[PDB]
């Protein structure tokens, strides 16, 4: 864990109120499960290691990082109060990719395939009950 990478996003904080909702259960059991096993998931399964990738400007450009490894921890460790917080984390991850990388770079095609799957699953996010 290089000192030249930022600390990862928060995944544990007892002062933040937590809740289980049926929508958060769906985000873990359906949405994360679907995207995590995709052939194109691997670049998104952990924080960007800017040192290992030789991208010293990455965290100069991307000031709101997010990745599916962080989202998985947040879902499995009940970090959220609602589904909108978790949806926003997925959307942040995709937008990071689209703002850092050139359109049609391989990483962008990979993100776009995951985002298409994401959108289909979020259109079926169940009514909160």
Short mmCIF file of C-alpha atoms in Angstrom, two decimals:
data_model
loop_
_atom_site.label_atom_id
_atom_site.label_comp_id
_atom_site.label_asym_id
_atom_site.label_seq_id
_atom_site.Cartn_x
_atom_site.Cartn_y
_atom_site.Cartn_z
CA UNK A 1 0.00 0.00 0.00
CA UNK A 2 2.02 3.00 -1.30
CA UNK A 3 2.07 6.33 0.56
CA UNK A 4 1.62 7.90 -2.90
CA UNK A 5 -1.92 6.50 -3.27
CA UNK A 6 -4.65 8.21 -1.25
CA UNK A 7 -6.37 6.46 1.58
CA UNK A 8 -9.36 4.49 0.25
CA UNK A 9 -12.96 5.75 0.70
CA UNK A 10 -14.45 5.26 4.16
CA UNK A 11 -16.02 1.76 4.67
CA UNK A 12 -16.32 1.69 8.51
CA UNK A 13 -17.57 4.43 10.83
CA UNK A 14 -19.69 3.66 13.90
CA UNK A 15 -20.97 7.24 14.09
CA UNK A 16 -22.75 6.92 10.71
CA UNK A 17 -26.31 5.53 11.10
CA UNK A 18 -26.85 2.23 9.24
CA UNK A 19 -29.91 0.50 7.92
CA UNK A 20 -30.90 -2.61 5.97
CA UNK A 21 -33.44 -1.92 3.23
CA UNK A 22 -34.84 -4.35 0.67
CA UNK A 23 -33.30 -2.08 -1.98
CA UNK A 24 -29.82 -2.35 -0.43
CA UNK A 25 -30.27 -6.16 -0.24
CA UNK A 26 -31.06 -6.09 -3.99
CA UNK A 27 -27.97 -3.97 -4.67
CA UNK A 28 -25.76 -6.62 -3.00
CA UNK A 29 -27.51 -9.85 -4.08
CA UNK A 30 -28.43 -8.83 -7.67
CA UNK A 31 -26.53 -5.74 -8.83
CA UNK A 32 -23.07 -6.19 -7.26
CA UNK A 33 -23.25 -10.00 -7.83
CA UNK A 34 -23.98 -9.45 -11.58
CA UNK A 35 -21.28 -6.81 -12.17
CA UNK A 36 -18.55 -8.45 -9.98
CA UNK A 37 -18.46 -11.67 -12.07
CA UNK A 38 -18.45 -9.89 -15.47
CA UNK A 39 -15.49 -10.55 -17.74
CA UNK A 40 -14.76 -6.78 -17.69
CA UNK A 41 -15.02 -6.31 -13.89
CA UNK A 42 -11.34 -6.71 -12.95
CA UNK A 43 -10.17 -3.06 -13.42
CA UNK A 44 -13.03 -1.95 -11.13
CA UNK A 45 -12.68 -4.51 -8.30
CA UNK A 46 -10.25 -2.39 -6.19
CA UNK A 47 -9.13 1.22 -5.92
CA UNK A 48 -6.98 2.48 -8.81
CA UNK A 49 -3.34 1.86 -7.78
CA UNK A 50 -1.88 4.88 -9.52
CA UNK A 51 1.70 3.88 -8.56
CA UNK A 52 1.45 0.37 -9.99
CA UNK A 53 -0.19 1.74 -13.21
CA UNK A 54 2.34 4.62 -13.56
CA UNK A 55 -0.47 7.23 -13.53
CA UNK A 56 0.92 9.90 -11.20
CA UNK A 57 -1.74 12.40 -12.35
CA UNK A 58 -4.70 10.03 -11.61
CA UNK A 59 -5.53 11.45 -8.15
CA UNK A 60 -4.73 14.96 -9.36
CA UNK A 61 -7.70 14.58 -11.78
CA UNK A 62 -9.97 12.19 -9.85
CA UNK A 63 -10.81 13.77 -6.51
CA UNK A 64 -13.86 11.58 -5.80
CA UNK A 65 -12.59 8.05 -6.36
CA UNK A 66 -14.82 4.98 -6.11
CA UNK A 67 -14.49 1.31 -7.08
CA UNK A 68 -16.52 -1.90 -6.73
CA UNK A 69 -14.21 -3.31 -4.06
CA UNK A 70 -15.14 -0.35 -1.85
CA UNK A 71 -18.84 -0.72 -2.78
CA UNK A 72 -18.69 -4.48 -1.96
CA UNK A 73 -17.22 -3.67 1.47
CA UNK A 74 -19.86 -0.97 2.06
CA UNK A 75 -22.69 -3.37 1.14
CA UNK A 76 -21.28 -6.40 3.06
CA UNK A 77 -20.41 -4.27 6.15
CA UNK A 78 -23.78 -2.41 6.16
CA UNK A 79 -22.33 1.09 5.65
CA UNK A 80 -25.33 2.65 3.88
CA UNK A 81 -28.61 4.16 5.05
CA UNK A 82 -30.27 3.99 1.62
CA UNK A 83 -29.95 2.71 -1.93
CA UNK A 84 -29.33 6.16 -3.39
CA UNK A 85 -25.98 6.37 -1.55
CA UNK A 86 -24.87 3.09 -3.17
CA UNK A 87 -26.22 3.97 -6.64
CA UNK A 88 -24.29 7.24 -6.39
CA UNK A 89 -21.09 5.25 -5.63
CA UNK A 90 -21.59 3.14 -8.79
CA UNK A 91 -22.23 6.30 -10.85
CA UNK A 92 -19.11 7.95 -9.39
CA UNK A 93 -17.03 4.92 -10.39
CA UNK A 94 -18.29 5.07 -13.99
CA UNK A 95 -17.85 8.83 -14.24
CA UNK A 96 -14.25 8.59 -12.91
CA UNK A 97 -13.49 6.24 -15.78
CA UNK A 98 -15.13 8.42 -18.41
CA UNK A 99 -13.43 11.63 -17.22
CA UNK A 100 -9.92 10.22 -16.86
CA UNK A 101 -9.73 8.04 -19.98
CA UNK A 102 -10.12 8.76 -23.72
CA UNK A 103 -13.44 7.67 -25.30
CA UNK A 104 -13.05 4.25 -26.91
CA UNK A 105 -10.00 3.32 -24.67
CA UNK A 106 -10.43 -0.31 -23.66
CA UNK A 107 -11.16 0.66 -20.05
CA UNK A 108 -14.04 2.90 -21.28
CA UNK A 109 -15.57 0.06 -23.35
CA UNK A 110 -15.34 -2.14 -20.25
CA UNK A 111 -17.03 0.47 -18.04
CA UNK A 112 -19.75 1.02 -20.63
CA UNK A 113 -20.57 -2.73 -20.69
CA UNK A 114 -20.86 -2.78 -16.88
CA UNK A 115 -22.92 0.41 -16.88
CA UNK A 116 -25.40 -1.06 -19.39
CA UNK A 117 -25.88 -4.05 -17.07
CA UNK A 118 -26.14 -1.67 -14.07
CA UNK A 119 -28.86 0.43 -15.70
CA UNK A 120 -30.94 -2.63 -16.54
CA UNK A 121 -30.72 -3.83 -12.95
CA UNK A 122 -31.48 -0.40 -11.40
CA UNK A 123 -34.54 0.00 -13.64
CA UNK A 124 -35.84 -3.12 -11.73
CA UNK A 125 -34.78 -1.87 -8.26
CA UNK A 126 -37.71 -2.96 -6.16
CA UNK A 127 -40.14 -0.66 -4.56
CA UNK A 128 -38.93 0.08 -0.97
CA UNK A 129 -40.95 -2.16 1.46
#
